[PDB]
Amino acid sequence: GLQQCMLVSECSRLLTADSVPPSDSTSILGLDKQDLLDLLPPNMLVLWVRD
């Protein structure tokens, strides 16, 4: 759970070049932050891991 949370976070950041919304910037592999958040373990497991 912890490894997966860190990995998702690391990869989310790879995608979010904090750059300026350009409404037009082509993401790597066409992936958005939301596509990665879906690969997170179930919310009950994430809270358990953080506690």
Add this chain to the structure above:
Amino acid sequence: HLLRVTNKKLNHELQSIVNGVQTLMSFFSTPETACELSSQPIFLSQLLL
């Protein structure tokens, strides 16, 4: 390996669409040459009234 499978599936579906559309278009092509007995006009536009 999963992406290779998915890639084959996507290529198959793209080919299916190409084959499907070609088949569909064969129904609209007027057999110029009298001779070929076989292709019975499906549409009334092709009907020899």
Add this chain to the structure above:
Amino acid sequence: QEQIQTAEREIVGQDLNCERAQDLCRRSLLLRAFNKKREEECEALCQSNKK
């Protein structure tokens, strides 16, 4: 002191940076997310073929 310095050089040389394994994990996750998106796209083309 000479022995300690040799041992120090060895520890510094062993600084296990599992960066390669981590890179592979990142790539794997990104590609998994990519695969999921491409599966959704395949399902959409399948629907068009049925029509």
Add this chain to the structure above:
Amino acid sequence: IIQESQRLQDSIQKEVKHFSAICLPALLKVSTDGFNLLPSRELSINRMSNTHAPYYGIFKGIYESVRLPLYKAPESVLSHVADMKKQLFFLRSQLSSRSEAI
């Protein structure tokens, strides 16, 4: 349709091949002045952070040449070199004084 379907032929494989060649850390861009996004690996503070960083081998060599320990923070390199220059000036002055005294 044939033309557009050909464009998308092996599209997944083509993309994966280009992705496999990219360096992921090059994607991590940080803004130091709020305006210019630079890859974190190009930051001067990270030149010694990882043995795999592009400039690690070069700066390792520079640290050893100026006798700066590898555990020291990268921000200390210029201050240290400045002190070394100060020492050189002092040694020259001492030599000149001693040569005059002799």
Add this chain to the structure above:
Amino acid sequence: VYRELGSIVQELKESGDKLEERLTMLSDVNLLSASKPRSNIDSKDLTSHR
């Protein structure tokens, strides 16, 4: 039949365009692996110059 075929061509075209955009992005030289550090110090490397 014309409207339906038209929609399929548009979907394939949009997908094709988006793919070309992504490929162009991934081919950027700055993203491509560890080119052997440059022998010359980049003008943007102020620390090495200093």
